[PDB]
Write a protein that binds this ligand. Structure first.
Ligand SMILES: Nc1nc2c(ncn2[C@@H]2O[C@H](COP(=O)(O)O)[C@@H](O)[C@H]2O)c(=O)[nH]1
Ligand SMILES: Nc1nc2c(ncn2[C@@H]2O[C@H](COP(=O)(O)O)[C@@H](O)[C@H]2O)c(=O)[nH]1
Lengths: 169, 167, 169, 167
């Protein structure tokens, strides 16, 4: 405890990147024809999902799922079916790559037309389980970050920008 | 089922209202001191929650709950609300039955304070007296979609509030 | 850790008591007319519920609920509605009286015709929150007990009898 | 909907079979060494689970799961099954689709071993090849109730397996 937070990725930049991601997601699926659904992982992805789904110019459903972050268990499964649909898992950040990994396995079992992941933040240096991540907003070093869904002791989750937890002594 | 969606509340108007609500909500708890948490009711309020919490200038946590004749908890909160100021975040209120119950349930956990902030309000359909401290818009009884709200699992992604036309 | 378990309440005695409880529950509701449902609290009440519901000679539904044992939260709510029905919460043991207390408040909100509690074991000396318990199988001192649903470090939950954890040194 | 329930498998026959299953299941894992857990699928198997685990003479944990076109987890396990022997406890298997999926899901968690033990089996209705290591009874395609199984949320409390007659 005892710290401060400084802006790392300004709100305006996040917006710009999400717009670009939006164009990409749109391009990648506009011609699929079949149903599409962006699946967000609670709690972390609520804000990113909000902004992102608005930038996706292709009709889709929005469902949320919440898995325990040693066994990965489902605390709240999807409400809608994903069989035969293009599914785009949406997370705020990927580091160890464990949850996204297992969640992706769980969902493939329901035999969807396709499965891809989209994460606002990517921390390559922390990957433990290799998992394919199609769309990434920003690649950053292993920095203590908060905001935009990412919390620190139940805090900063509502920050419109990505912050860096400094930590005084 | 064939239908049309017409804009009802354009994106900019919502943005502006959310900003006002933020100010109001901020002014209301900025001096509480106790911890604060905004509770969104899935699925419909995820978007409203995302934009609203950014406009709330007071350190708070963000949790979600999802409730369904009896009102049952499909997914409870992750946080304890006891002794905290709790702002329930809803997308829309009409009958008033659901918020009515969800509020009762949370009240049992004895929070510092309990309140509700709904984006839309169709007071023409209330069948239950329920305290609603914050309202973004009071509206006609139209079938609204967008900004989180759906229609046959559709339209939640629209950045504006729309009305289904049907024919 | 490092211990042994000795029989405290033999399986045959448990059966006898449950039969008696069964007669009582049956007597108490046989003339209600309205729907009845025994609500069990997982994990602990699964075995007790199994035996008990068979001793209740009055048509009823069997539903389960599972609440976190500081705020009491619902991890899995009831599947069926209880409004206007006689509800009999079923637990393996009541001590502090906290969970049963909150669970009872949660359920009264759904306005059932009636709410009562039935617990196999009662530990009066540990009550922190006073809550009415209509049917009790056995009243025991604050003993380290296991079996019949009550576990000790994920163990003894399948014992057909109530045991006492001795604890060597 | 008007109907009649006739006994199909009397209480004593079930008691005896459960005893046998216990012996079999016991003999099968008594030398594993690794931790063991029987997983019951709510709601229907709660009774079968209660009687079966008592007949299993090997230290184990007892957990429950409840699954629902897609097979979704309404309530996951409380325990981790990784590296443990897992015995899925079901009340009845017919199509085979549900157990089929639940098994896939648990398999992902990499348990020491995975198996299924169902009380009833209607092999005349299988549409999916699924491994079932233990079966209490193989039966005709009757509509069974009792011993946990229901009919319009009714009859789960019967101590015997019955068949609905309809007229
Ligand atoms: N899609 C959609 N859902 C609605 C509408 N009006 C009410 N609802 C549903 O009813 C709930 C609110 O119920 P209340 O609190 O009034 O009982 C909302 O969470 C929402 O899911 C509407 O116009 N469109
Ligand atoms: N009440 C009742 N449920 C049944 C019956 N046959 C199948 N089921 C349901 O189907 C599930 C098993 O499905 P399966 O594994 O064969 O796909 C059981 O958990 C049960 O809930 C029946 O005769 N009566």
């Amino acid at each position: 405890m005892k710290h401060t937070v400084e802006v790392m990725i300004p709100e305006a930049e996040i917006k710009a990147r999400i717009a670009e991601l939006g164009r990409q997601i749109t391009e990648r699926y506009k011609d699929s024809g079949s149903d599409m659904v962006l699946v967000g992982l609670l709690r972390g992805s609520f804000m990113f999902m909000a902004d992102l789904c608005r930038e996706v110019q292709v009709s889709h459903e929005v469902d949320f799922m919440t898995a325990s972050s040693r066994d990965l268990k489902i605390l709240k499964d999807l409400d809608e079916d994903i069989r035969g649909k293009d599914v785009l898992i949406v997370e705020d950040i990927i580091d160890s790559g464990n949850t996204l990994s297992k969640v992706r396995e769980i969902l493939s079992l329901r035999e969807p037309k396709s499965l891809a992941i989209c994460t606002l933040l990517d921390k390559p240096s922390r990957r433990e389980v290799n998992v394919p991540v199609e769309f990434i907003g920003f690649s950053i070093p292993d920095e203590f970050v908060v905001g935009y869904g990412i919390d620190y002791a139940q805090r900063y989750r509502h920050l419109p920008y990505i912050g860096k937890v400094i930590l005084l002594d």
